[PDB]
Each structure stands twice: as C-alpha cells, then as structure tokens.
Amino acid sequence: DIVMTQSPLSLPVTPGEAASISCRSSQSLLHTNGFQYLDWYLQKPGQSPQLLIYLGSNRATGVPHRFSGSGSGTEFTLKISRVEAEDVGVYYCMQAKESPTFGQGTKVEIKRTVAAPSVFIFPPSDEQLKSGTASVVCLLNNFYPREAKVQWKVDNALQSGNSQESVTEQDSKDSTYSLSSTLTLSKADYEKHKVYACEVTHQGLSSPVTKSFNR
Amino acid sequence: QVQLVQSGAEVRKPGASVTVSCKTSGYTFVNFYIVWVRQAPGQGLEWMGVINPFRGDTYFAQKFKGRVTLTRDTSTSTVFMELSSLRSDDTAIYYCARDLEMRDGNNHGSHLEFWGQGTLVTVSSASTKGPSVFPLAPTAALGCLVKDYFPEPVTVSWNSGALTSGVHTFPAVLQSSGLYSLSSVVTVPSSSLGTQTYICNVNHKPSNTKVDKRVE
Numbered sequence: 550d551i552v553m554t555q556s557p558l559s560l561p562v563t564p565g566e567a568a569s570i571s572c573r574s575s576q577s578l579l580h581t582n583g584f585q586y587l588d589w590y591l592q593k594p595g596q597s598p599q600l601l602i603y604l605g606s607n608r609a610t611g612v613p614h615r616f617s618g619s620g621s622g623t624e625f626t627l628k629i630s631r632v633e634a635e636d637v638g639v640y641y642c643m644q645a646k647e648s649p650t651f652g653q654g655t656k657v658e659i660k661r662t663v664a665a666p667s668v669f670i671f672p673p674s675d676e677q678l679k680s681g682t683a684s685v686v687c688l689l690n691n692f693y694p695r696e697a698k699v700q701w702k703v704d705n706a707l708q709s710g711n712s713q714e715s716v717t718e719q720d721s722k723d724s725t726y727s728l729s730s731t732l733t734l735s736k737a738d739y740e741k742h743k744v745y746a747c748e749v750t751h752q753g754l755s756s757p758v759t760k761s762f763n764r
Numbered sequence: 765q766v767q768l769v770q771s772g773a774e775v776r777k778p779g780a781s782v783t784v785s786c787k788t789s790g791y792t793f794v795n796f797y798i799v800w801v802r803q804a805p806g807q808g809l810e811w812m813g814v815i816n817p818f819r820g821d822t823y824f825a826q827k828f829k830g831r832v833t834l835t836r837d838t839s840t841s842t843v844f845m846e847l848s849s850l851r852s853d854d855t856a857i858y859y860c861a862r863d864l865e866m867r868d869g870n871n872h873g874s875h876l877e878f879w880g881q882g883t884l885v886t887v888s889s890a891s892t893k894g895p896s897v898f899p900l901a902p903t904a905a906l907g908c909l910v911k912d913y914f915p916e917p918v919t920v921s922w923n924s925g926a927l928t929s930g931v932h933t934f935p936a937v938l939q940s941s942g943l944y945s946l947s948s949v950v951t952v953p954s955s956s957l958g959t960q961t962y963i964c965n966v967n968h969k970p971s972n973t974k975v976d977k978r979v980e
C-alpha cells in the first residue's frame with residue numbers, strides 16, 4: 550500500500566567522499582504519537598540486513614557518526630561520510646507507519662577509474678560432450694563500471710535466448726567486477742557449426758572486442 | 765548478548781509446506797515482538813508479519829494472510845513460522861528479527877535490531893543432485909564449470925585453499941531444467957601453464973565432493 554521510492558538505485562563514491570540517498574514515500578510517515586516511522590537498513594554482500602538508523606534520525610548502537618539520517622513527512626535522506634569499502638552494499642529504507650514496506654534498495658559502490666574487461670573464451674570440454682550438451686563460457690574479467698554487454702555468435706549468427714550470466718560483487722581490494730556468461734547448445738547443434746565468438750561492449754573499450762575459437 | 769538462531773536450509777515440492785524456526789536467547793523472550801521478512805534471491809526485502817510472543821497474536825501483510833501462521837513456544841523461547849501452498853516464487857531466504865524496544869502496543873511499528881542468520885527455503889520439483897564438474901581450459905585464465913546440481917549452495921576453492929589470488933567464483937544461475945550451474949575461474953601468469961598444476965575443489969552438501977585437475 551504505502552510506496553517507498555529510493556534514488557538513485559546505484560551510487561558510486563570515491564573513497565573518502567560523501568554519499569547521499571533519498572527515500573520518498575507516497576504519503577507521510579509521521580504518526581499522531583509524533584514519531585516518524587522510517588528506518589534505514591544496510592545489507593552487506595552475503596550478510597543479513599542490519600539496522601543503521603531508526604525513526605528518521607537515530608543511530609543504532611555501534612553505527613558511527615559518519616552515518617546521518619534526516620528529513621520527515623514524505624522525504625528522508627541518509628548521508629554517509631568518508632565512504633570506505635566496508636560501507637559497500639545495498640541500503641534499504643522501510644516505513645512502519647502502516648503495513649511495512651521497503652524501498653527497492655540503493656547499491657553503494659566504490660568509484661574508480663574506468664577499466665576495460667580482459668575477455669576469455671572457453672570451449673566445452675571433450676568430457677561434457679559425451680552427454681548431449683555443450684556449454685561455451687565467456688569470462689569478462691576485472692572491469693569497471695559494472696555495465697557490460699555480452700553478445701554470442703555462432704558462425705556469426707547472433708544468439709538470443711540460450712545464454713545466462715552473473716556478475717561478482719565489487720572486489721574491495723581493486724574495486725572491479727567480473728562477469729561470466731554461458732552459451733548452452735546441444736551436442737548436435739555444437740558439432741555442425743565452427744566459429745564460436747564472444748562479443749563484448751564496455752565503456753573502457755574504444756570499440757566492441759571479440760574472442761573466438763574454432764571447433 | 766542477544767542472538768536469534770534459525771534452523772537449517774529446506775527444500776520443498778510446490779504445494780507442500782515448510783516450518784522455519786528461530787531460537788532466541790539473551791533477553792526476555794516475552795518482552796519483544798518478533799518479525800519475519802524474506803528475500804527472493806538477487807531481490808529486495810519483503811516484510812511478512814509479526815508475532816507478540818506474550819499473547820501469541822499475529823499480524824501479516826496482505827500477501828501473506830492466506831498462508832502464513834506464526835506460533836511460539838515460551839518455554840524454549842522459539843518462534844515458528846509456517847508457510848503453506850508453496851510455489852516456486854516462495855524460494856527465498858527467510859529471516860526473523862527482534863524489535864529494538866520492549867513491546868509498545870505497536871507491533872508492525874517494529875525496528876529490526878537483531879536478526880537471524882537466515883533460512884534458505886527452495887521450492888522446486890527438482891530432486892537432489894550433485895554437479896558434474898568440467899574444466900575451463902586455457903596472464904591467462906582457466907576455470908571450472910560446476911554444472912547441473914540442486915539445490916544451492918556449492919563451495920569451490922583452488923588447490924585445496926592455496927590459491928586465492930585472482931580467483932572469482934560466480935553466483936549460480938538457475939537453468940530451465942531446474943538445476944543450478946555455476947562457474948569458478950582464475951587468472952594466472954601465462955608462464956605457469958607449463959609449470960604449476962591447478963585444481964578446483966568442489967563441495968556440494970548434500971552430499972558430494974569432487975576434485976578436478978586443470979591442464980593444457
């Protein structure tokens with residue numbers, strides 16, 4: 550029912566500088582008892598969520614002054630100062646004025662100089678071929694920022710609908726991402742074509758790069 | 765030191781039902797609301813409902829009124845969450861959490877200060893299956909394809925833990941067959957392909973280990 554909107558949905562920050570997130574609600578979160586029912590939670594990669602701020606502006610025990618929550622009514626702000634890698638994660642707002650709802654989360658990451666992916670292509674192993682399936686893998690390694698696009702080609706025909714991919718979390722040491730993509734064909738379909746090609750477009754690349762192999 | 769400890773991962777067929785428990789300690793069980801929240805994988809947080817462990821009365825978001833009951837044992841200060849008529853999209857991590865302050869009459873008004881570790885519940889008609897593991901054969905990049913297992917999770921390490929630098933183990937994807945697939949890769953000095961040997965070590969509880977050599 551009450552709707553929570555958070556912007557931006559992802560927020561890169563230079564180590565050391567400040568970050569601000571907005572949370573906007575479809576209606577006031579101020580109760581007649583005079584409390585402002587807005588809480589911020591942080592979820593760090595692969596951990597439970599944790600409470601940062603309750604009631605607009607109260608820090609939960611252990612949360613440092615660097616985190617500052619404010620605003621009221623239908624407008625709230627979480628400011629994070631002196632951002633370090635340890636702050637990376639998704640920040641959600643949540644109202645408890647009525648049946649609670651969350652906003653959709655703001656991914657906070659560390660900003661670094663743009664970096665072009667190193668690309669690799671792997672044929673399916675002779676080993677897996679014995680059983681009717683062929684998986685062709687593409688690795689886009691150590692890049693920044695996160696947007697990247699993989700296009701598969703099979704004898705130069707554009708593939709669609711037969712690939713899946715996922716991306717690592719940001720390396721907190723080097724602040725990059727890696728991406729893995731998998732083209733699955735059937736052994737028969739694999740054996741009747743020759744050129745298997747991984748085409749990659751990023752922002753660190755002057756033009757799209759291709760890695761390929763024959764067999 | 766306050767602690768909410770949940771029970772282990774669960775797998776269910778569509779249509780079945782599941783019970784996650786949450787064992788609390790370190791405070792007066794009966795003095796604090798307990799809240800459930802879930803997260804679909806790679807998705808946001810979704811608020812499920814709340815129980816008063818003293819009266820037993822509950823409140824659920826509309827989407828969960830049909831199908832969730834919450835119950836409580838005051839003698840073992842555990843809270844039980846039961847979800848029936850499961851569907852694939854109930855596949856999620858389920859968390860219990862405790863309100864910050866003592867019961868104020870306002871149960872949905874709660875601030876989730878202390879959280880469980882979470883329970884994975886996967887809903888699927890698939891049945892338990894350990895992966896086949898295939899080499900991604902080759903600064904140079906090599907890897908393992910960990911394919912056709914169910915359910916999550918697997919673990920992967922390289923040369924029995926030795927190799928950690930340059931390693932990336934990706935999040936698994938769910939295929940159309942309803943089995944997971946995952947890749948693990950590592951970058952390495954081109955000059956080591958001739959010399960060093962590389963092995964990824966794969967564990968799938970329940971209950972399956974594979975060790976695979978990476979040459980060429």
Ligand SMILES: [Cl-]
Binds near residue numbers: 557558559
């Ligand atoms: Cl955005």
Ligand SMILES: [Cl-]
Binds near residue numbers: 612613
């Ligand atoms: Cl923190």
Ligand SMILES: [Cl-]
Binds near residue numbers: 613614615
């Ligand atoms: Cl402080």
Ligand SMILES: [Cl-]
Binds near residue numbers: 766791
């Ligand atoms: Cl306490």
